[PDB]
Short mmCIF file of C-alpha atoms and ligand atoms in Angstrom, two decimals:
data_model
loop_
_atom_site.label_atom_id
_atom_site.label_comp_id
_atom_site.label_asym_id
_atom_site.label_seq_id
_atom_site.Cartn_x
_atom_site.Cartn_y
_atom_site.Cartn_z
CA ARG A 4 0.00 0.00 0.00
CA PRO A 5 2.41 2.68 -1.21
CA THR A 6 2.47 6.15 0.31
CA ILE A 7 2.98 7.57 -3.21
CA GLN A 10 -2.45 1.35 -5.51
CA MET A 11 -3.23 -2.30 -6.47
CA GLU A 12 -6.46 -3.03 -8.42
CA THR A 13 -8.18 -5.81 -10.43
CA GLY A 14 -5.98 -6.97 -13.33
CA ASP A 15 -2.79 -6.62 -11.24
CA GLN A 16 -0.51 -9.56 -10.45
CA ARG A 17 1.73 -9.51 -7.40
CA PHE A 18 5.03 -11.24 -7.93
CA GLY A 19 7.45 -11.06 -5.05
CA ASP A 20 7.72 -7.37 -4.12
CA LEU A 21 6.47 -6.14 -7.51
CA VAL A 22 3.19 -5.73 -9.37
CA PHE A 23 2.62 -6.52 -13.07
CA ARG A 24 -0.31 -5.44 -15.26
CA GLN A 25 -0.94 -6.50 -18.84
CA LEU A 26 -1.72 -3.45 -21.02
CA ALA A 27 -1.80 -5.07 -24.48
CA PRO A 28 -1.21 -8.56 -25.93
CA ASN A 29 2.59 -8.00 -25.88
CA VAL A 30 2.96 -5.20 -23.33
CA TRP A 31 3.05 -5.22 -19.53
CA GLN A 32 3.61 -2.53 -16.90
CA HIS A 33 6.07 -3.33 -14.12
CA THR A 34 5.71 -1.58 -10.74
CA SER A 35 8.27 -1.55 -7.91
CA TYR A 36 8.35 0.24 -4.54
CA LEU A 37 10.98 2.19 -2.64
CA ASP A 38 10.43 2.09 1.16
CA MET A 39 11.51 5.40 2.64
CA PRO A 40 12.06 5.35 6.45
CA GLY A 41 9.43 7.46 8.26
CA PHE A 42 7.57 8.10 4.98
CA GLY A 43 6.53 4.82 3.35
CA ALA A 44 6.69 3.31 -0.09
CA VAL A 45 6.91 5.11 -3.46
CA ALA A 46 5.72 3.33 -6.64
CA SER A 47 7.47 3.55 -9.98
CA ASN A 48 6.33 2.04 -13.29
CA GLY A 49 8.16 0.79 -16.37
CA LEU A 50 7.32 -1.44 -19.33
CA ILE A 51 7.96 -4.96 -20.63
CA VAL A 52 7.49 -5.56 -24.36
CA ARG A 53 7.49 -8.90 -26.22
CA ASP A 54 8.71 -8.45 -29.86
CA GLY A 55 10.00 -11.03 -32.40
CA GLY A 56 10.93 -13.81 -29.87
CA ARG A 57 12.54 -11.43 -27.43
CA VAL A 58 11.66 -9.15 -24.56
CA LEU A 59 12.55 -5.45 -24.36
CA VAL A 60 12.48 -3.58 -21.05
CA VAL A 61 11.78 0.11 -20.42
CA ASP A 62 13.25 1.28 -17.09
CA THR A 63 14.68 -0.71 -14.21
CA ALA A 64 13.07 -1.00 -10.80
CA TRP A 65 14.40 1.05 -7.90
CA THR A 66 17.02 -1.58 -6.90
CA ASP A 67 19.11 -4.36 -8.30
CA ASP A 68 17.18 -6.97 -6.34
CA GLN A 69 13.83 -5.69 -7.56
CA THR A 70 15.17 -5.63 -11.13
CA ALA A 71 16.32 -9.27 -10.79
CA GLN A 72 12.73 -9.97 -9.71
CA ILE A 73 11.47 -8.39 -12.95
CA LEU A 74 13.76 -10.70 -14.87
CA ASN A 75 12.46 -13.71 -12.90
CA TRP A 76 8.86 -12.70 -13.66
CA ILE A 77 9.74 -12.48 -17.33
CA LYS A 78 11.26 -15.97 -17.16
CA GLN A 79 8.18 -17.44 -15.55
CA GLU A 80 5.47 -15.62 -17.53
CA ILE A 81 7.04 -15.07 -20.97
CA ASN A 82 10.12 -17.32 -21.04
CA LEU A 83 11.97 -15.50 -23.84
CA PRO A 84 15.39 -13.89 -23.85
CA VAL A 85 15.61 -10.27 -22.71
CA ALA A 86 17.44 -8.56 -25.55
CA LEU A 87 17.84 -4.99 -24.32
CA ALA A 88 16.64 -2.31 -21.95
CA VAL A 89 16.07 1.43 -22.52
CA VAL A 90 16.21 3.59 -19.34
CA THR A 91 14.54 6.98 -19.45
CA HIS A 92 16.68 9.23 -17.22
CA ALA A 93 19.37 9.16 -14.56
CA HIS A 94 17.34 8.85 -11.35
CA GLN A 95 16.96 5.82 -9.06
CA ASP A 96 13.43 4.91 -10.11
CA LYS A 97 14.57 4.43 -13.73
CA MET A 98 18.22 3.32 -13.37
CA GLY A 99 18.57 1.90 -9.87
CA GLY A 100 18.84 -1.66 -11.21
CA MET A 101 21.38 -1.38 -13.99
CA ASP A 102 23.85 -3.85 -12.43
CA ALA A 103 21.17 -6.57 -12.41
CA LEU A 104 20.54 -6.05 -16.13
CA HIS A 105 24.28 -6.10 -16.89
CA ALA A 106 24.90 -9.24 -14.88
CA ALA A 107 22.16 -10.99 -16.90
CA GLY A 108 23.85 -10.15 -20.21
CA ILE A 109 21.18 -7.58 -21.22
CA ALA A 110 22.35 -4.73 -23.43
CA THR A 111 21.45 -1.33 -22.00
CA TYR A 112 20.72 1.98 -23.65
CA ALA A 113 20.20 5.48 -22.31
CA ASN A 114 20.48 9.07 -23.54
CA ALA A 115 24.18 9.99 -23.68
CA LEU A 116 23.36 12.76 -21.19
CA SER A 117 21.82 10.23 -18.83
CA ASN A 118 24.99 8.20 -18.97
CA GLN A 119 27.09 11.32 -18.26
CA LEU A 120 24.85 12.29 -15.32
CA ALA A 121 24.54 8.74 -13.99
CA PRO A 122 27.52 8.60 -11.66
CA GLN A 123 26.71 12.08 -10.33
CA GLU A 124 23.13 10.85 -9.57
CA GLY A 125 24.37 7.67 -7.84
CA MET A 126 23.57 5.43 -10.84
CA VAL A 127 25.51 2.97 -13.00
CA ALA A 128 25.57 4.16 -16.60
CA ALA A 129 24.01 2.18 -19.43
CA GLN A 130 26.45 0.41 -21.76
CA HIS A 131 25.35 2.30 -24.84
CA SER A 132 24.44 5.93 -25.50
CA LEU A 133 21.50 7.08 -27.56
CA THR A 134 21.79 10.39 -29.37
CA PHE A 135 19.04 12.50 -30.84
CA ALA A 136 18.33 14.76 -33.79
CA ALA A 137 17.37 18.37 -33.22
CA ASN A 138 13.75 17.33 -33.75
CA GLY A 139 14.00 14.88 -30.84
CA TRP A 140 13.98 11.59 -32.67
CA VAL A 141 16.68 9.06 -31.82
CA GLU A 142 19.56 8.74 -34.28
CA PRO A 143 18.77 5.31 -35.82
CA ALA A 144 22.29 3.86 -35.76
CA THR A 145 22.45 4.40 -31.97
CA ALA A 146 19.27 2.29 -31.39
CA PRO A 147 19.80 -0.89 -33.37
CA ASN A 148 17.31 -3.79 -33.23
CA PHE A 149 14.76 -1.76 -31.24
CA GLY A 150 11.78 -3.53 -32.76
CA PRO A 151 8.61 -1.55 -32.13
CA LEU A 152 10.22 0.90 -29.70
CA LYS A 153 10.26 4.50 -30.96
CA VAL A 154 12.51 6.62 -28.78
CA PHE A 155 11.97 10.36 -28.56
CA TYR A 156 13.76 13.09 -26.60
CA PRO A 157 11.14 15.77 -26.01
CA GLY A 158 13.43 18.42 -24.53
CA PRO A 159 14.21 19.28 -20.91
CA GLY A 160 11.39 18.85 -18.44
CA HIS A 161 11.39 16.67 -15.36
CA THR A 162 15.15 16.51 -15.99
CA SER A 163 17.36 17.69 -18.82
CA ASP A 164 17.96 14.08 -19.97
CA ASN A 165 14.41 12.66 -19.88
CA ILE A 166 13.42 10.48 -22.85
CA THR A 167 10.16 8.90 -23.88
CA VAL A 168 9.17 5.72 -25.76
CA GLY A 169 6.29 4.82 -28.05
CA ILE A 170 5.38 1.26 -28.94
CA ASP A 171 4.54 0.94 -32.64
CA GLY A 172 1.52 -1.14 -33.44
CA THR A 173 -0.08 -0.38 -30.07
CA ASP A 174 -2.02 2.43 -28.47
CA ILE A 175 0.75 2.99 -25.88
CA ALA A 176 3.30 5.70 -25.28
CA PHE A 177 5.49 5.99 -22.20
CA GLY A 178 6.17 9.43 -20.77
CA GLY A 179 8.20 8.24 -17.80
CA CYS A 180 8.57 10.91 -15.18
CA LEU A 181 7.88 13.75 -17.59
CA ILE A 182 4.12 13.20 -17.65
CA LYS A 183 1.89 13.29 -14.60
CA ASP A 184 -1.70 12.11 -14.51
CA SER A 185 -4.72 14.12 -15.48
CA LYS A 186 -5.83 14.62 -11.81
CA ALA A 187 -2.37 15.41 -10.45
CA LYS A 188 -1.96 18.41 -8.15
CA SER A 189 1.67 18.96 -9.06
CA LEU A 190 4.49 17.89 -11.29
CA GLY A 191 6.28 15.78 -8.64
CA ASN A 192 9.93 16.41 -7.95
CA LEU A 193 10.97 19.60 -9.77
CA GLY A 194 14.38 19.83 -8.10
CA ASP A 195 16.25 18.84 -11.30
CA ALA A 196 13.55 20.26 -13.67
CA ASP A 197 13.73 22.84 -16.41
CA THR A 198 10.82 25.07 -15.51
CA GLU A 199 11.19 27.27 -18.61
CA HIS A 200 11.05 24.47 -21.18
CA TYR A 201 8.92 21.86 -19.44
CA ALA A 202 5.60 22.80 -21.07
CA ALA A 203 7.04 22.70 -24.59
CA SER A 204 8.65 19.34 -23.84
CA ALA A 205 5.34 17.85 -22.61
CA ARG A 206 3.63 19.12 -25.78
CA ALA A 207 6.43 17.77 -27.94
CA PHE A 208 5.89 14.31 -26.43
CA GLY A 209 2.18 14.52 -27.33
CA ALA A 210 2.97 15.58 -30.90
CA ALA A 211 5.61 12.86 -31.32
CA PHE A 212 3.10 10.15 -30.40
CA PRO A 213 -0.12 11.63 -31.74
CA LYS A 214 -1.82 8.28 -32.16
CA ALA A 215 -1.24 6.92 -28.56
CA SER A 216 -4.42 6.79 -26.48
CA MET A 217 -2.90 5.07 -23.46
CA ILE A 218 -0.29 7.22 -21.73
CA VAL A 219 1.90 5.27 -19.33
CA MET A 220 3.92 7.13 -16.76
CA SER A 221 6.19 6.49 -13.84
CA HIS A 222 4.08 7.40 -10.80
CA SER A 223 0.42 6.92 -11.75
CA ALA A 224 -1.71 4.32 -13.49
CA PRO A 225 -2.08 4.54 -17.27
CA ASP A 226 -4.21 7.52 -18.34
CA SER A 227 -5.74 9.18 -21.40
CA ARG A 228 -4.13 11.92 -23.41
CA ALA A 229 -5.61 14.31 -20.86
CA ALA A 230 -2.45 13.54 -18.80
CA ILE A 231 -0.40 15.23 -21.52
CA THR A 232 -2.68 18.29 -21.70
CA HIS A 233 -2.84 18.58 -17.92
CA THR A 234 0.92 18.20 -17.50
CA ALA A 235 1.53 20.91 -20.09
CA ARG A 236 -0.96 23.30 -18.44
CA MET A 237 0.61 22.76 -15.01
CA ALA A 238 3.99 23.43 -16.62
CA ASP A 239 2.74 26.61 -18.33
CA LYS A 240 2.31 27.99 -14.75
CA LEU A 241 6.04 27.52 -14.01
CA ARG A 242 7.18 30.04 -16.67
CA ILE B 3 8.53 26.67 -3.11
CA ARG B 4 7.25 23.81 -5.31
CA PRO B 5 7.02 20.77 -3.06
CA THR B 6 7.13 17.27 -4.44
CA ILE B 7 4.26 16.31 -2.08
CA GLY B 8 1.67 18.90 -0.92
CA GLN B 9 -0.28 21.74 -2.45
CA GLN B 10 1.53 24.33 -4.53
CA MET B 11 1.47 28.10 -4.04
CA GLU B 12 -1.60 29.95 -5.34
CA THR B 13 -3.06 33.45 -5.25
CA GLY B 14 -3.53 34.54 -1.66
CA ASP B 15 -0.50 32.73 -0.27
CA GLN B 16 2.18 34.62 1.65
CA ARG B 17 5.76 33.31 1.55
CA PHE B 18 7.51 34.08 4.86
CA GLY B 19 11.02 32.73 5.19
CA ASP B 20 10.81 29.01 4.45
CA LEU B 21 7.06 28.78 5.10
CA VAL B 22 3.76 29.71 3.42
CA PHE B 23 0.72 31.21 5.11
CA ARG B 24 -2.84 31.27 3.72
CA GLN B 25 -5.75 33.12 5.29
CA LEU B 26 -8.81 30.82 5.42
CA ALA B 27 -11.20 33.04 7.42
CA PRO B 28 -10.94 36.42 9.13
CA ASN B 29 -9.49 34.72 12.22
CA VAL B 30 -7.95 31.53 10.75
CA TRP B 31 -4.77 30.95 8.81
CA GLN B 32 -3.04 27.80 7.53
CA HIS B 33 0.68 27.42 8.12
CA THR B 34 2.71 25.29 5.71
CA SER B 35 6.27 24.04 6.21
CA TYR B 36 8.48 21.78 4.08
CA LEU B 37 10.74 18.81 4.77
CA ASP B 38 13.43 18.29 2.11
CA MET B 39 14.15 14.62 1.55
CA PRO B 40 17.39 14.06 -0.38
CA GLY B 41 16.73 12.76 -3.86
CA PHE B 42 12.92 13.20 -3.48
CA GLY B 43 12.30 16.91 -2.77
CA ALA B 44 10.10 18.72 -0.35
CA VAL B 45 7.05 17.44 1.53
CA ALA B 46 4.50 20.04 2.74
CA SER B 47 2.71 19.81 6.09
CA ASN B 48 -0.09 22.12 7.17
CA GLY B 49 -1.40 23.36 10.52
CA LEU B 50 -3.57 26.19 11.77
CA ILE B 51 -3.35 29.54 13.49
CA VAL B 52 -6.52 30.94 15.09
CA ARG B 53 -7.10 34.39 16.56
CA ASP B 54 -9.46 34.33 19.58
CA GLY B 55 -9.83 37.95 20.76
CA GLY B 56 -6.56 39.15 22.27
CA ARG B 57 -4.70 35.81 21.93
CA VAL B 58 -3.67 33.30 19.27
CA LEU B 59 -4.02 29.49 19.30
CA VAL B 60 -1.89 27.11 17.21
CA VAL B 61 -2.69 23.65 15.80
CA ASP B 62 0.43 21.58 15.03
CA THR B 63 4.06 22.50 14.85
CA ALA B 64 6.12 22.63 11.67
CA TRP B 65 8.55 19.80 10.83
CA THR B 66 11.41 21.43 12.74
CA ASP B 67 12.14 23.80 15.62
CA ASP B 68 13.52 26.45 13.30
CA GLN B 69 10.44 26.33 11.08
CA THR B 70 8.22 26.49 14.17
CA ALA B 71 10.11 29.55 15.42
CA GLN B 72 9.36 31.06 11.99
CA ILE B 73 5.65 30.45 12.56
CA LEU B 74 5.94 32.36 15.83
CA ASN B 75 7.77 35.17 14.05
CA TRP B 76 5.00 35.37 11.41
CA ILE B 77 2.38 35.54 14.17
CA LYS B 78 4.36 38.39 15.84
CA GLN B 79 4.61 40.33 12.55
CA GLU B 80 1.09 39.81 11.17
CA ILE B 81 -1.04 39.52 14.30
CA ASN B 82 1.10 40.85 17.16
CA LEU B 83 -0.81 38.97 19.87
CA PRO B 84 0.45 36.30 22.31
CA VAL B 85 0.14 32.61 21.62
CA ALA B 86 -1.81 31.11 24.48
CA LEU B 87 -1.45 27.44 23.64
CA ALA B 88 -0.79 24.90 20.95
CA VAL B 89 -2.59 21.56 20.29
CA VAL B 90 -0.56 18.96 18.36
CA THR B 91 -2.46 16.23 16.60
CA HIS B 92 -0.27 13.08 16.77
CA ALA B 93 3.23 11.90 17.53
CA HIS B 94 4.87 12.21 14.12
CA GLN B 95 7.49 14.75 13.05
CA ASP B 96 5.20 16.77 10.82
CA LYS B 97 2.92 17.58 13.78
CA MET B 98 5.35 17.54 16.77
CA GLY B 99 8.80 18.16 15.31
CA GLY B 100 8.86 21.75 16.59
CA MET B 101 7.83 21.28 20.24
CA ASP B 102 11.08 22.72 21.58
CA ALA B 103 10.49 26.04 19.80
CA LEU B 104 7.04 26.29 21.41
CA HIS B 105 8.44 25.48 24.87
CA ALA B 106 11.28 27.98 24.50
CA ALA B 107 8.70 30.63 23.68
CA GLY B 108 6.74 29.82 26.81
CA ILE B 109 3.70 28.43 25.02
CA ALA B 110 1.57 25.83 26.81
CA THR B 111 1.37 22.63 24.77
CA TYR B 112 -1.36 19.99 24.64
CA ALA B 113 -1.64 16.60 22.96
CA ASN B 114 -3.58 13.36 23.37
CA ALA B 115 -2.16 11.51 26.41
CA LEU B 116 -1.30 8.70 23.98
CA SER B 117 0.62 11.06 21.76
CA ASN B 118 2.64 12.16 24.79
CA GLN B 119 3.30 8.53 25.67
CA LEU B 120 4.37 7.74 22.08
CA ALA B 121 6.43 10.92 21.35
CA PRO B 122 9.55 9.79 23.21
CA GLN B 123 9.45 6.47 21.31
CA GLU B 124 9.82 8.55 18.13
CA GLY B 125 12.71 10.66 19.59
CA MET B 126 10.38 13.65 20.04
CA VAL B 127 9.37 15.76 22.98
CA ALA B 128 5.98 15.30 24.61
CA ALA B 129 3.56 18.17 25.05
CA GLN B 130 3.41 19.55 28.58
CA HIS B 131 -0.25 18.66 29.08
CA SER B 132 -2.36 15.67 28.15
CA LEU B 133 -5.84 15.61 26.65
CA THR B 134 -8.14 12.73 27.37
CA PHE B 135 -11.30 11.68 25.62
CA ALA B 136 -14.71 10.23 26.27
CA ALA B 137 -15.90 6.95 24.78
CA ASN B 138 -17.60 8.88 21.96
CA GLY B 139 -14.37 10.80 21.13
CA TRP B 140 -15.11 14.24 22.59
CA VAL B 141 -12.31 15.76 24.65
CA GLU B 142 -12.81 15.85 28.42
CA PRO B 143 -13.30 19.61 28.98
CA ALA B 144 -11.27 19.80 32.18
CA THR B 145 -8.24 18.61 30.18
CA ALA B 146 -8.70 21.38 27.60
CA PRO B 147 -8.95 24.53 29.71
CA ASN B 148 -9.61 27.82 28.00
CA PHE B 149 -9.44 26.34 24.49
CA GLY B 150 -11.79 29.01 23.11
CA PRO B 151 -12.99 27.97 19.68
CA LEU B 152 -10.86 24.81 19.45
CA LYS B 153 -13.17 21.79 19.72
CA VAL B 154 -10.98 18.73 19.99
CA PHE B 155 -12.31 15.34 18.89
CA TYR B 156 -10.63 11.91 18.90
CA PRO B 157 -12.22 10.04 16.01
CA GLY B 158 -10.68 6.63 16.68
CA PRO B 159 -7.58 4.98 15.28
CA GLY B 160 -6.81 5.70 11.63
CA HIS B 161 -3.63 7.23 10.32
CA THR B 162 -2.31 6.48 13.78
CA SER B 163 -3.87 5.25 16.99
CA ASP B 164 -3.40 8.67 18.62
CA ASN B 165 -4.60 10.98 15.83
CA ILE B 166 -6.89 13.80 16.95
CA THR B 167 -8.90 16.39 15.05
CA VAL B 168 -10.01 19.98 15.77
CA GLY B 169 -13.14 21.90 14.80
CA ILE B 170 -12.95 25.68 14.86
CA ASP B 171 -16.15 26.85 16.57
CA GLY B 172 -17.70 29.98 15.12
CA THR B 173 -16.47 28.99 11.67
CA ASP B 174 -17.26 26.40 9.06
CA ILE B 175 -13.74 24.91 9.28
CA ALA B 176 -12.59 21.59 10.72
CA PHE B 177 -9.03 20.20 10.76
CA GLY B 178 -8.53 16.51 10.08
CA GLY B 179 -4.71 16.53 10.25
CA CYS B 180 -3.14 13.44 8.77
CA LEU B 181 -6.29 11.34 9.08
CA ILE B 182 -7.95 13.01 6.09
CA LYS B 183 -6.64 13.05 2.54
CA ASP B 184 -7.95 15.17 -0.29
CA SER B 185 -10.91 14.29 -2.47
CA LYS B 186 -8.62 13.40 -5.46
CA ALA B 187 -6.04 11.48 -3.49
CA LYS B 188 -4.73 8.25 -4.91
CA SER B 189 -3.81 6.83 -1.48
CA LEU B 190 -4.12 7.27 2.25
CA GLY B 191 -0.49 8.39 2.60
CA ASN B 192 1.75 6.66 5.04
CA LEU B 193 -0.05 3.66 6.55
CA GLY B 194 3.00 2.42 8.49
CA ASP B 195 1.43 3.23 11.87
CA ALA B 196 -2.21 3.00 10.66
CA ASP B 197 -5.13 0.98 11.91
CA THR B 198 -6.50 -0.44 8.68
CA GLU B 199 -9.43 -2.14 10.40
CA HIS B 200 -10.83 0.99 12.07
CA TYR B 201 -9.71 3.75 9.68
CA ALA B 202 -12.93 4.05 7.67
CA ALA B 203 -15.11 4.32 10.76
CA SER B 204 -12.69 6.90 12.26
CA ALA B 205 -12.82 9.05 9.11
CA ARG B 206 -16.61 8.93 9.16
CA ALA B 207 -16.67 9.70 12.86
CA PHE B 208 -14.71 12.91 12.19
CA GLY B 209 -17.28 13.91 9.60
CA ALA B 210 -20.14 13.22 11.98
CA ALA B 211 -18.45 15.17 14.81
CA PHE B 212 -18.37 18.30 12.66
CA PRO B 213 -21.38 17.80 10.38
CA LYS B 214 -21.67 21.40 9.29
CA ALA B 215 -17.99 22.03 8.55
CA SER B 216 -17.74 22.84 4.86
CA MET B 217 -13.99 23.57 4.69
CA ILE B 218 -11.85 20.56 5.64
CA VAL B 219 -8.23 21.35 6.35
CA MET B 220 -5.65 18.58 6.35
CA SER B 221 -1.95 18.05 6.70
CA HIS B 222 -0.76 17.32 3.14
CA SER B 223 -3.08 19.04 0.71
CA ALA B 224 -4.95 22.29 0.31
CA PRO B 225 -8.25 22.87 2.09
CA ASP B 226 -11.03 20.88 0.52
CA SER B 227 -14.73 20.16 0.66
CA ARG B 228 -16.41 17.40 2.65
CA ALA B 229 -15.58 15.15 -0.29
CA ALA B 230 -12.16 14.81 1.35
CA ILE B 231 -13.86 13.03 4.27
CA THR B 232 -16.06 10.81 2.12
CA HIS B 233 -13.26 9.95 -0.29
CA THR B 234 -10.90 9.17 2.59
CA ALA B 235 -13.52 6.85 4.06
CA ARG B 236 -14.12 5.13 0.72
CA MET B 237 -10.35 4.54 0.28
CA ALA B 238 -10.25 3.17 3.84
CA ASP B 239 -13.18 0.80 3.20
CA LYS B 240 -10.80 -1.00 0.76
CA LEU B 241 -8.28 -1.69 3.53
CA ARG B 242 -10.57 -4.00 5.54
C1 3S0 C 1 18.64 9.86 -7.95
O1 3S0 C 1 17.25 9.56 -7.77
N1 3S0 C 1 16.97 9.36 -6.36
C2 3S0 C 1 15.71 9.22 -6.15
C3 3S0 C 1 14.69 9.25 -7.22
O2 3S0 C 1 14.63 8.38 -8.07
N2 3S0 C 1 13.82 10.26 -7.16
C4 3S0 C 1 12.91 10.58 -8.24
C5 3S0 C 1 12.96 12.09 -8.39
O3 3S0 C 1 13.26 12.81 -7.41
O4 3S0 C 1 12.72 12.55 -9.52
C6 3S0 C 1 11.45 9.96 -7.96
N3 3S0 C 1 10.57 10.59 -8.98
C7 3S0 C 1 9.65 11.46 -8.77
C8 3S0 C 1 9.10 12.13 -9.97
O5 3S0 C 1 8.49 13.19 -9.90
O6 3S0 C 1 9.34 11.50 -11.09
C9 3S0 C 1 9.11 11.92 -7.46
C10 3S0 C 1 7.90 11.04 -7.22
C11 3S0 C 1 10.12 11.79 -6.32
S1 3S0 C 1 10.84 10.14 -6.25
C12 3S0 C 1 15.30 9.03 -4.78
C13 3S0 C 1 16.09 9.06 -3.70
C14 3S0 C 1 15.26 8.91 -2.56
C15 3S0 C 1 14.03 8.77 -3.00
O7 3S0 C 1 14.00 8.84 -4.39
C1 3S0 C 2 8.12 10.59 13.14
O1 3S0 C 2 7.59 10.92 11.86
N1 3S0 C 2 8.65 10.92 10.88
C2 3S0 C 2 8.24 11.37 9.75
C3 3S0 C 2 6.85 11.85 9.53
O2 3S0 C 2 6.38 12.77 10.18
N2 3S0 C 2 6.18 11.27 8.54
C4 3S0 C 2 4.77 11.48 8.38
C5 3S0 C 2 4.18 10.08 8.31
O3 3S0 C 2 5.02 9.26 7.71
O4 3S0 C 2 3.13 9.76 8.75
C6 3S0 C 2 4.38 12.38 7.13
N3 3S0 C 2 2.93 12.18 6.92
C7 3S0 C 2 2.38 11.56 5.95
C8 3S0 C 2 0.94 11.27 6.11
O5 3S0 C 2 0.36 10.40 5.43
O6 3S0 C 2 0.33 12.00 6.99
C9 3S0 C 2 3.04 11.05 4.71
C10 3S0 C 2 2.91 12.22 3.75
C11 3S0 C 2 4.51 10.73 4.91
S1 3S0 C 2 5.39 12.12 5.64
C12 3S0 C 2 9.16 11.47 8.63
C13 3S0 C 2 10.46 11.11 8.50
C14 3S0 C 2 10.82 11.41 7.11
C15 3S0 C 2 9.73 11.90 6.53
O7 3S0 C 2 8.69 11.96 7.44
ZN1 ZN C 3 13.35 11.58 -12.01
ZN1 ZN C 4 10.25 9.58 -11.10
ZN1 ZN C 5 1.56 10.92 10.84
ZN1 ZN C 6 1.38 13.54 8.06
#
């Protein structure tokens, strides 16, 4: 029962929760227990593509991330080819060593990799770079299957990236996008308050077709999460 | 100040040092203070300040002594009347972290007897006086001398076993502290010390104690309607 909830359609597995979102897409949820404060949920994705599994974001810790891999073994039983992690904070990159130990190739924005050690994180093995329009440079993201990686500009952090899943209704905003009933934008300590609104809108325009918006700290929402996030961010300028 | 958890600043609000103050009624203000958690950001906590004639009454400290001293400095600047007493609403840091600042200022402090018994087990300082309660939750009046408009009610165990609540007589405001979450809340906050069996009934008991309060003030979000009480209770129904 995190401080920052479980419903029908959720599967507990060890200390994590999994929810199927589409025939080949699942949301993973893990929890950080903070002394005196309680547990904080964070969400990522698991995608089955062409006999392999692709992961978006680690859990908060190496042990929780190893639990993700065990769930994948039990439920899907296909090799995990790669992971994409969406910025250099613990909720997204806390489990990199578990991925590396398992032989999984890891990818992050070059800037995330540069920030990683300064943020307490292990860097990904490979760096993604981006065009001026935000789209990933194709040669840096080989064999990504249906994953469409987009850098929307600075927002929650300067390095935040986002991921659409081609052939589905799903796009993943990570910690950039907050839900349509949110009171705030979460932790703004590392945020770019000038550019945030434009970055939220750029995410929406990059994935114009996605009706299910997945994000780190709330359940999947409509495109109203994008609109609402942008309007909250307009107030920061 | 843009806390990670808690309401944001809006029109009305006064920034004073590290805190924010919002007038809720001619004689009632909300104080807000912030705890920075490394890697997570700031967490807001709210209490109340009430003017009762020629004296001021406080509900809850800030997270720290220094923040609580700042509350007292705001009261001196904006109201310029003495603080007669403070009521603190359970033995967690957000509500009792600043007891030493109140004691240094010479302010009489009151808490549930249970909160005073628990405070030292959390490394905190007990209030100097103990409130006790009837079987229906109303404070025993002899334990709450000269409380003016503060009507203290123990609704039963919920967020904690000791949590108390305060209606402000002569207004349409009631304070639920950390028992009550806002009408759009996704969770009941920290349940580490909570009574999941009794929470829903306790939330409803608070609503029934102050049935004509239309403005519900709470620790970690902006003042809300009575939908905060009903939503809290509905979330708590799921815990049993
Ligand atoms: C380096 O990252 N360390 C983190 C961490 O991952 N914090 C993130 C952050 O602050 O952005 C989490 N993300 C958040 C967000 O708005 O995306 C909020 C929730 C706070 S917790 C941390 C340390 C302690 C608790 O969380
Ligand atoms: C002794 O209390 N120590 C606290 C503390 O006051 N925590 C409180 C609590 O957890 O109940 C706050 N209150 C909360 C609540 O649901 O009322 C949530 C917000 C977590 S922060 C603490 C340590 C670090 C952050 O909060
Ligand atoms: Zn982050
Ligand atoms: Zn986050
Ligand atoms: Zn508490
Ligand atoms: Zn609290």
